[PDB]
DNA sequence: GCACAATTTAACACTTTTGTCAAG
């Protein structure tokens, strides 16, 4: 269940707090809807009660989550396909899919490779992209604009953010 | 869309020609 108030994630919306839940006129009977709003937008979203596990509302990590997901993402990795296509395309449904876990384990090899050969003009973006949803993913739970939240990665990375 | 061989270009170290000056 969420809350009115409650602080949740709607991909590829990255975070957003439930304002509540309403009767939606769909189709036929108006079935409970929660409502997902993003100040930072202006959009707006309606989700089904029925099954929210099933559209990947998860909810903003806690507090207690930060140190974990940076110990993989400074070092953590994973092997991918070599030819372009499948490599990118997985690495596009991971940040589709709305997983901080996977999407800084995806940035950690990311990072390996990018500096080392150098990055494809393709896994360029499936990097920028990735630590997109991050930073304002710490600014949804430590409540720190992407300012201070990027000032995170700073340290388990080596370098800034952009 | 990308790794890369292919070929072009700007890059530059340096040699030789050509305009030039004070003095016969």
Not at 10 to 20: F, I, K, N, S
Not at 132 to 137: D, G, N, T
Request: no cysteine; glycine share 8%.
């Amino acid at each position: 269940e969420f809350r009115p108030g409650d602080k949740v994630v709607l991909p590829p919306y990255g975070v957003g707090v439930v304002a509540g839940i309403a009767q939606r006129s769909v189709s036929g009977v108006s079935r409970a809807y929660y409502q997902v709003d993003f100040p930072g937008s202006r959009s707006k979203a309606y989700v089904p009660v029925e099954a929210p596990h099933s559209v990947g509302l998860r909810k903003a990590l806690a507090p207690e989550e930060v140190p974990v997901i940076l110990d993989l993402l400074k070092n953590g990795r994973m092997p991918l396909p070599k030819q372009w296509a499948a490599r990118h395309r997985k690495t596009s449904e991971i940040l589709a899919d709305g997983n901080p876990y996977r999407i800084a384990q995806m940035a950690g090899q990311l990072r390996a490779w990018e500096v080392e050969r150098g990055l494809p003009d393709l896994d360029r973006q499936a990097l920028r992209r990735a630590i997109h949803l991050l930073a304002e993913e710490v600014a949804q739970s430590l409540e720190i604009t992407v300012q201070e939240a990027k000032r995170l990665f700073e340290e388990a990375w080596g370098e800034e953010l952009n």
